[PDB]
């Protein structure tokens, strides 16, 4: 066990059962809808649906957003196994996870993203799979920048020979010459502003359009 | 020590120093601006600036948003002590924290909010202080609903005799008759949608207008 690729649900240590409620609504979405794109991942996936204009770029494409703030790779794995891929036949699955895998080496997080791609390839063999690169983070140079850049290296080399697996680097150049990330792009140096989402979402919406 | 009212910074166990970067930008805001309202608290404060239209209701009023996702009462206390109230002379300080105080009884969280009100009263004696009630949370009946309702009781009774301390319950009736909270109000049963923020922000914008 890489802990990153061992499927496990987020345990409720708070009391309000929200994670599980999120997961059950997505399962019910899958039972009742027929998306062509399913988006899955952590809060950069999740807030794209609020905080981007999803409705203009991504709703036309017939698209479910199954992002869950705080998810690591292994949580996304558990949710694809436990009913979020039932009853559906997407053409494309977009995956954006790995920046919450705290305490996991870049090689373990890469192993996590590879297990996600593998599960999607078995459970939904017709779909293309898109993996987004992990964005830089923090206001200044720090070790999670180099973690995320190393995951992106190891992931892009892993996907390089998959005909229907696409790695996408959506970073527009968020880190400036002086090393800084501006809070106009990322209000807390991790999560994207409305401004930060635009270039990200049009790099993805293009890729989505070529594929589809 | 109530842990809730013992001032302490969030320690960086991730590596990118974002919390501290957030705090330093707010300190620099305070050094360089002259707000009349400062908003402080957790992510319901923070995302109101993105995810509400802040610019229409709250920007006219000359208003800084110092919300930090994940903050407990004791983290907000530390940030008001360590330079977010320097160089400024607000008329009104709005406080919205306590739903992240996991592992604290409702009485301890109340003790936390009282220490915040006390610090604001000493460091900025001219300001009114508004405390928002803690919103319900989770999709169904659960113990954090009753925690939050008990904090609101103990807080409103604490503030009842303060002439310049105002408790505000902004809840429009988010919990329905069947016990549920809809994901249209709260997308993850905690954080508010654009739709969920509107009634909240106009109850607050009114209060703000009477006071000012």
XYZ file of C-alpha atoms in Angstrom:
424
model
C 0.000 0.000 0.000
C 0.930 3.378 -1.180
C -1.559 5.173 1.108
C -2.321 7.375 -1.943
C -3.683 4.472 -3.979
C -5.386 2.610 -1.188
C -9.089 3.391 -1.587
C -10.546 4.767 1.660
C -13.490 7.069 2.519
C -12.917 10.287 4.511
C -13.873 9.379 8.102
C -16.245 11.855 9.836
C -14.427 13.233 12.914
C -16.666 16.365 13.054
C -20.215 14.952 13.391
C -22.285 16.391 10.530
C -21.621 13.617 7.950
C -21.092 16.042 5.033
C -18.471 14.096 3.117
C -20.774 11.064 2.876
C -23.685 13.306 1.972
C -21.678 14.789 -0.887
C -20.796 11.285 -2.058
C -24.402 10.056 -1.950
C -25.661 13.042 -3.946
C -23.088 12.322 -6.692
C -24.136 8.643 -6.736
C -27.756 9.776 -7.098
C -26.642 12.170 -9.861
C -24.977 9.272 -11.615
C -28.058 7.038 -11.179
C -30.375 9.711 -12.666
C -28.230 11.625 -15.209
C -26.352 10.910 -18.442
C -23.319 13.199 -18.422
C -20.732 13.132 -21.201
C -18.027 14.678 -18.975
C -17.526 13.891 -15.284
C -15.268 16.129 -13.295
C -13.750 14.657 -10.133
C -11.157 15.852 -7.651
C -10.604 18.221 -4.767
C -11.755 21.791 -4.187
C -10.177 23.220 -7.369
C -12.607 20.941 -9.215
C -15.437 21.738 -6.786
C -15.270 25.577 -6.802
C -14.898 25.697 -10.570
C -18.664 25.019 -10.580
C -19.414 27.996 -8.307
C -16.520 30.280 -8.828
C -15.808 29.811 -12.470
C -18.519 30.154 -15.050
C -19.090 26.554 -15.493
C -22.474 27.333 -17.024
C -20.934 29.073 -20.040
C -18.006 26.736 -20.891
C -18.879 23.398 -19.276
C -22.676 23.011 -18.928
C -23.203 22.813 -22.716
C -20.916 19.743 -22.663
C -23.207 17.746 -20.365
C -21.014 17.657 -17.303
C -21.191 16.576 -13.643
C -18.913 18.138 -10.998
C -17.958 15.632 -8.256
C -15.253 17.732 -6.555
C -14.968 17.520 -2.766
C -12.877 20.046 -0.862
C -10.099 18.291 1.036
C -10.056 15.074 -1.039
C -6.728 13.286 -1.513
C -6.094 10.806 -4.354
C -7.177 7.851 -2.178
C -10.529 9.530 -1.364
C -11.227 10.148 -5.042
C -10.349 6.486 -5.689
C -12.902 5.272 -3.091
C -15.652 7.449 -4.565
C -15.126 6.161 -8.122
C -15.273 2.605 -6.711
C -18.353 3.098 -4.494
C -20.942 4.258 -6.940
C -19.980 7.547 -8.636
C -19.223 5.687 -11.903
C -22.406 3.510 -11.859
C -25.298 3.984 -14.345
C -23.275 6.240 -16.639
C -21.134 6.147 -19.786
C -19.150 9.377 -19.914
C -17.018 10.122 -22.948
C -14.507 12.021 -20.858
C -13.390 11.884 -17.197
C -11.338 14.830 -15.875
C -9.267 14.220 -12.768
C -7.717 16.941 -10.617
C -6.345 15.767 -7.265
C -3.005 15.445 -5.430
C -2.362 18.873 -3.852
C -3.994 17.663 -0.605
C -1.886 14.474 -0.285
C 0.015 15.853 2.727
C 2.566 13.402 4.113
C 2.903 11.607 0.711
C 6.047 11.842 -1.415
C 5.598 13.040 -4.997
C 6.119 9.408 -6.133
C 3.248 8.161 -3.924
C 0.945 10.968 -5.123
C 1.847 10.028 -8.748
C 1.050 6.396 -7.803
C -2.321 7.676 -6.580
C -3.133 9.489 -9.821
C -2.074 6.427 -11.819
C -4.490 4.240 -9.779
C -7.276 6.700 -10.559
C -6.551 6.514 -14.302
C -6.457 2.696 -14.072
C -9.795 2.471 -12.273
C -11.434 4.780 -14.806
C -9.931 2.665 -17.623
C -11.426 -0.522 -16.127
C -14.788 0.732 -14.945
C -15.324 3.095 -17.917
C -13.082 1.769 -20.713
C -14.697 4.042 -23.398
C -13.777 7.330 -21.668
C -10.811 9.527 -22.375
C -9.119 10.583 -19.120
C -7.697 14.083 -18.541
C -5.330 14.736 -15.646
C -4.604 18.332 -14.782
C -1.198 19.303 -13.483
C -1.010 20.425 -9.872
C -0.873 24.193 -9.671
C 1.836 26.031 -7.777
C 0.921 27.275 -4.354
C 1.990 29.577 -1.538
C 2.946 33.234 -1.906
C 6.689 32.547 -2.179
C 9.085 29.722 -3.149
C 8.395 26.725 -0.909
C 8.671 22.924 -0.893
C 5.091 22.235 -2.122
C 5.950 24.037 -5.345
C 8.705 21.492 -5.965
C 6.493 18.595 -4.761
C 3.809 19.676 -7.258
C 6.252 20.178 -10.132
C 7.691 16.702 -9.439
C 4.234 15.070 -9.433
C 3.551 16.837 -12.773
C 6.820 15.515 -14.189
C 6.216 11.956 -13.011
C 2.560 12.068 -14.174
C 3.204 13.455 -17.659
C 5.898 10.840 -18.235
C 3.448 8.164 -16.995
C 0.672 9.278 -19.366
C 2.910 9.984 -22.340
C 2.177 6.565 -23.832
C -1.542 6.347 -23.154
C -3.530 7.039 -26.329
C -6.688 7.937 -24.381
C -5.015 9.465 -21.271
C -4.222 13.189 -21.552
C -2.022 15.194 -19.178
C -2.790 18.934 -19.316
C -0.707 21.715 -17.749
C -3.228 24.543 -17.304
C -0.822 26.847 -15.458
C -0.708 30.193 -17.277
C 2.440 31.313 -15.463
C 0.971 32.049 -12.024
C 4.439 32.296 -10.402
C 6.090 35.602 -11.407
C 9.808 36.447 -11.882
C 10.095 37.659 -8.278
C 8.894 34.229 -7.118
C 5.474 35.492 -5.944
C 1.935 34.375 -6.581
C -0.496 37.267 -6.595
C -3.665 37.055 -4.446
C -5.578 38.313 -7.494
C -4.991 34.887 -9.067
C -5.201 32.876 -5.860
C -6.856 34.631 -2.931
C -5.215 32.360 -0.303
C -2.259 31.275 -2.495
C -3.915 27.864 -3.249
C -7.507 28.370 -4.359
C -8.157 30.337 -7.548
C -10.046 33.610 -7.830
C -12.619 34.170 -10.580
C -9.634 35.725 -12.451
C -7.359 32.733 -11.761
C -9.998 30.274 -13.064
C -10.409 31.834 -16.512
C -7.143 30.879 -18.167
C -7.286 27.512 -16.364
C -10.823 26.799 -17.581
C -10.165 27.866 -21.159
C -7.047 25.692 -21.467
C -9.274 22.808 -20.268
C -12.308 23.734 -22.400
C -10.110 23.680 -25.522
C -8.634 20.240 -24.800
C -12.219 19.104 -24.035
C -13.325 20.423 -27.423
C -10.568 18.755 -29.435
C -11.187 15.295 -27.891
C -15.031 15.512 -28.014
C -7.134 28.303 29.375
C -10.191 27.666 27.397
C -8.280 26.617 24.251
C -10.860 28.721 22.341
C -9.763 31.965 23.984
C -6.070 31.263 24.147
C -4.546 33.291 21.310
C -2.436 31.073 19.033
C -1.398 31.226 15.345
C -2.225 28.336 12.977
C 1.011 26.306 12.770
C 2.155 25.414 9.212
C 2.232 21.592 8.949
C 1.977 21.674 5.105
C 5.021 23.739 4.019
C 3.731 26.629 1.892
C 3.236 29.186 4.722
C -0.141 30.431 3.411
C -1.823 31.167 6.722
C 0.993 33.539 7.724
C 0.968 35.080 4.268
C -2.745 35.795 4.595
C -2.123 37.361 8.000
C 0.718 39.576 6.756
C -1.341 40.866 3.826
C -4.150 41.891 6.220
C -1.611 43.648 8.479
C -0.301 45.491 5.413
C -3.911 46.315 4.469
C -4.427 47.731 7.929
C -1.163 49.729 7.765
C -2.122 51.279 4.388
C -5.951 51.535 4.431
C -8.652 53.310 6.443
C -11.638 50.962 6.492
C -14.823 51.798 8.384
C -15.876 48.123 8.611
C -13.501 45.204 9.188
C -14.803 41.734 8.620
C -12.987 38.909 10.407
C -13.632 35.204 10.816
C -13.453 31.891 9.019
C -14.312 30.913 5.455
C -17.941 32.126 5.592
C -16.429 35.588 6.075
C -13.703 34.924 3.493
C -15.845 33.631 0.577
C -18.427 36.360 1.064
C -15.856 38.578 -0.700
C -15.604 36.243 -3.713
C -18.837 34.396 -3.695
C -21.231 37.031 -2.549
C -21.390 40.389 -4.231
C -19.417 42.181 -1.707
C -18.772 44.931 -4.241
C -22.441 45.935 -4.386
C -23.447 45.795 -0.681
C -20.178 46.045 1.260
C -17.524 47.906 -0.786
C -19.421 51.228 -0.595
C -19.109 50.949 3.210
C -15.300 50.988 3.167
C -14.675 47.446 4.287
C -11.764 45.004 4.685
C -12.319 41.222 4.598
C -9.880 39.353 6.895
C -11.548 35.916 6.734
C -9.290 32.852 6.719
C -10.698 29.445 5.830
C -10.246 27.037 8.727
C -9.832 29.667 11.479
C -11.134 28.843 14.961
C -11.928 31.529 17.565
C -8.396 31.328 19.025
C -6.815 31.931 15.582
C -8.976 34.998 15.015
C -7.948 36.203 18.492
C -4.216 35.898 17.644
C -4.649 37.824 14.393
C -6.448 40.751 16.061
C -3.616 40.848 18.635
C -0.711 40.579 16.160
C -1.293 43.507 13.897
C -4.637 43.288 12.056
C -6.092 46.046 14.288
C -3.037 48.389 14.054
C -3.102 51.726 12.149
C -6.889 51.743 11.825
C -10.021 53.113 13.501
C -12.979 51.138 12.183
C -16.481 52.159 13.183
C -17.690 48.583 13.026
C -16.041 45.155 13.471
C -18.003 42.093 12.282
C -17.003 38.745 13.734
C -18.045 35.369 12.338
C -16.185 32.379 13.783
C -16.861 29.267 15.903
C -18.093 26.598 13.451
C -14.509 25.293 13.101
C -13.866 24.935 16.866
C -13.878 21.122 16.659
C -13.235 19.458 20.014
C -14.559 22.524 21.951
C -17.832 22.456 23.885
C -20.389 25.131 23.004
C -19.465 26.901 26.286
C -15.765 27.080 25.308
C -16.628 28.353 21.807
C -18.874 31.024 23.437
C -15.903 31.856 25.719
C -13.850 32.273 22.539
C -16.311 34.678 20.922
C -16.532 36.660 24.165
C -12.705 37.029 24.219
C -12.844 38.338 20.657
C -15.456 40.957 21.597
C -13.348 41.937 24.636
C -10.165 42.362 22.607
C -11.970 44.491 20.028
C -13.453 46.581 22.874
C -9.971 47.207 24.327
C -7.934 47.661 21.179
C -10.685 49.533 19.271
C -13.009 50.965 21.946
C -14.901 53.211 19.424
C -16.129 50.321 17.237
C -19.471 48.608 17.386
C -19.041 44.817 17.282
C -21.379 42.497 15.342
C -21.352 38.759 16.001
C -23.157 36.555 13.535
C -24.885 33.420 14.728
C -23.386 30.125 13.621
C -25.340 28.699 10.722
C -26.754 25.190 10.752
C -24.784 22.589 8.893
C -24.915 19.077 7.471
C -27.640 17.700 5.212
C -29.647 16.150 8.063
C -30.154 16.539 11.838
C -26.792 16.093 13.564
C -24.930 17.140 16.721
C -23.207 20.222 15.193
C -26.635 21.731 14.602
C -27.288 21.566 18.344
C -23.715 22.709 19.159
C -24.231 25.753 16.905
C -27.690 26.560 18.272
C -26.273 26.355 21.820
C -23.369 28.700 20.993
C -25.941 31.128 19.499
C -28.030 30.929 22.667
C -25.070 31.451 24.987
C -23.686 34.268 22.777
C -26.927 36.227 22.407
C -27.480 36.082 26.162
C -23.862 37.254 26.655
C -24.265 40.236 24.307
C -27.772 41.166 25.397
C -26.440 43.812 27.779
C -23.720 45.319 25.617
C -24.854 48.650 24.158
C -22.281 48.505 21.341
C -22.178 44.689 20.869
C -24.789 43.309 18.449
C -25.698 39.639 17.991
C -27.312 38.968 14.594
C -29.055 35.751 13.531
C -28.798 35.839 9.726
C -30.309 32.381 9.209
C -33.259 32.691 6.818
C -34.599 29.241 7.688
C -32.025 27.081 5.890
C -33.208 23.889 7.659
C -36.546 22.756 6.161
C -39.473 20.892 7.810
C -38.084 17.521 6.694
C -34.851 18.332 8.549
C -32.790 18.820 5.358
C -30.503 21.551 4.137
C -30.612 21.932 0.379
C -27.322 21.989 -1.590
C -28.722 25.001 -3.460
C -28.212 27.014 -0.260
C -25.066 25.241 0.893
C -23.234 23.256 -1.773
C -21.393 21.040 0.768
C -23.897 21.542 3.632
C -21.574 24.095 5.374
C -20.405 26.710 2.889
C -23.011 28.940 1.244
C -23.804 29.124 -2.457
C -24.264 32.473 -4.209
C -27.988 31.870 -3.435
C -27.321 31.071 0.242
C -25.259 34.274 0.688
C -27.949 36.709 -0.465
C -30.376 36.583 2.435
C -27.407 36.308 4.826
C -25.689 39.365 3.342
C -28.826 41.493 3.241
C -29.698 40.773 6.883
C -26.127 41.924 7.680
C -26.132 44.915 5.300
C -29.304 46.223 6.977
C -27.910 45.965 10.516
C -24.729 47.623 9.150
C -26.845 50.455 7.755
C -28.812 51.106 10.938
C -25.672 51.316 13.138
C -23.599 53.381 10.633
